[PDB]
């Protein structure tokens, strides 16, 4: 609803016998990636991944590269501690993932902050919506919770999320506005493919849209066909835009009873589509 | 810009 | 499992038109842990010039990557994506269907 987000996504993966853990970061504004960092690169540095961030000066790239390097070291300590918390051997590979950032409304004010973690793909600990307290998933994460309560760690996260996060996201929006503040509506169509004498597939397509959030549904006689609709995951085209389709198997002769409904932020009004022979 | 000064788990 | 097997889609950037340059995409998603190997194939042979996106993940912590290459589709050339991951006994091959 005119809103925007910034998110950073960190992955640290240990690899016993194959070096120290790898740390990768990516940063997004909404559905647009704009930076990366990879500790396995030949000379690890924050790098631009969108044209609108290229303008930032050498101080930007230098500062941020030192932040990632320090974070990577911190994640290495975290991974060691986590192996102990779960009584795990030194032989296995493990993964520590972090996601954090801020959502703002059309006026630029903070709507929500996030700062959370997963270990081996399972939720571990999360900063609560209040930005003051933590939810721990198990007794290991209660250890991290007690440490971070003692350290008043949430106060620091809060200060970032209400301050720098919002301020930098506002800047990025202004610098990248022609892309970041533009919704590209889906180009839509319906195809028809006989399966047999008795049945046909209707597939409703949405192409070329941004951002990625969309709803595609089929109705039969105005009734949603949730249980009978094949939906693919929304997927990137490679040109900043996204694609999706939804299909239904229908009795031959009944195609006109089916309507495809499309909702997207770039559409003034939801679309209704039918197969047009 | 990413966040700085986070402590270990 | 503590492991999740990849979802695989194979598709073109633009609607396929024989003889017109395009991009062939293999989108792998939903997987954990992050190590994965992906080849794009033309008539069963590995395509050498293939790029991929930077590793990212979804709200449920599962990873996703886009692998892609420029290609010019024709009537008779077959394309496919071949994926290996720890959750797979053997590599999985998904053929490109221009209508999917």
Author numbering:
A (entry chain A): 0 to 276
B (entry chain C): 1 to 9
C (entry chain B): 0 to 99
Paper quotes:
To explore this notion, we first solved the atomic structures of HLA-B*07:02, HLA-B*42:01 and HLA-B*81:01 with TL9-p24. The total number of contacts, buried surface area and surface complementarities were comparable in TL9-p24 structures in complex with HLA-B*07:02, HLA-B*42:01 and HLA-B*81:01. Although peptide positions 1–4 and 8–9 were in similar orientations in both HLA-B*07:02-TL9, HLA-B*42:01-TL9 and HLA-B*81:01-TL9 structures, residues 5–7 in the HLA-B*81:01-TL9 structure, which differs in the peptide-presentation platform by just 4 and 3 residues compared to HLA-B*07:02 and HLA-B*42:01, respectively, were flipped into the opposite orientation. This ‘conformational switch’ resulted in Leu5 and Thr7 acting as secondary anchor residues in HLA-B*81:01-TL9, as opposed to being solvent exposed in HLA-B*07:02-TL9 and HLA-B*42:01-TL9 complexes. In contrast, the same residue served as a secondary anchor residue in HLA-B*07:02-TL9 and HLA-B*42:01-TL9. HLA-B*07:02 and HLA-B*42:01 have Trp at position 147, whereas HLA-B*81:01 has Leu147. Trp147, in HLA-B*07:02 and HLA-B*42:01, made three van der Waals (VdW) contacts with Thr7 and Met8 in the peptide, compared to just one VdW contact between Leu147 in HLA-B*81:01 and Met8, contributing to the respective peptide conformations. A second important difference occurred at HLAI residue 156 (with Arg, Asp and Leu at this position in HLA-B*07:02, HLA-B*42:01 and HLA-B*81:01 respectively) which contributed to the conformational differences observed at peptide residues Gln3, Asn6 and Thr7 (showing HLA-B*07:02 and HLA-B*81:01).
The HLAI residues that are polymorphic are mainly those forming the peptide-binding groove, which contains six binding pockets (A to F) that define the size and chemical characteristics of the specific peptide repertoire that can be accommodated by each HLAI molecule. In this study we focus on two HIV-1-specific epitopes and their presentation by 4 different members of the HLA-B7 superfamily, HLA-B*07:02, HLA-B*42:01, HLA-B*42:02 and HLA-B*81:01. We show that single polymorphisms between different alleles of the HLA-B7 superfamily can induce a conformational switch in peptide conformation that is associated with differential HLAI-specific escape mutation and immune control.
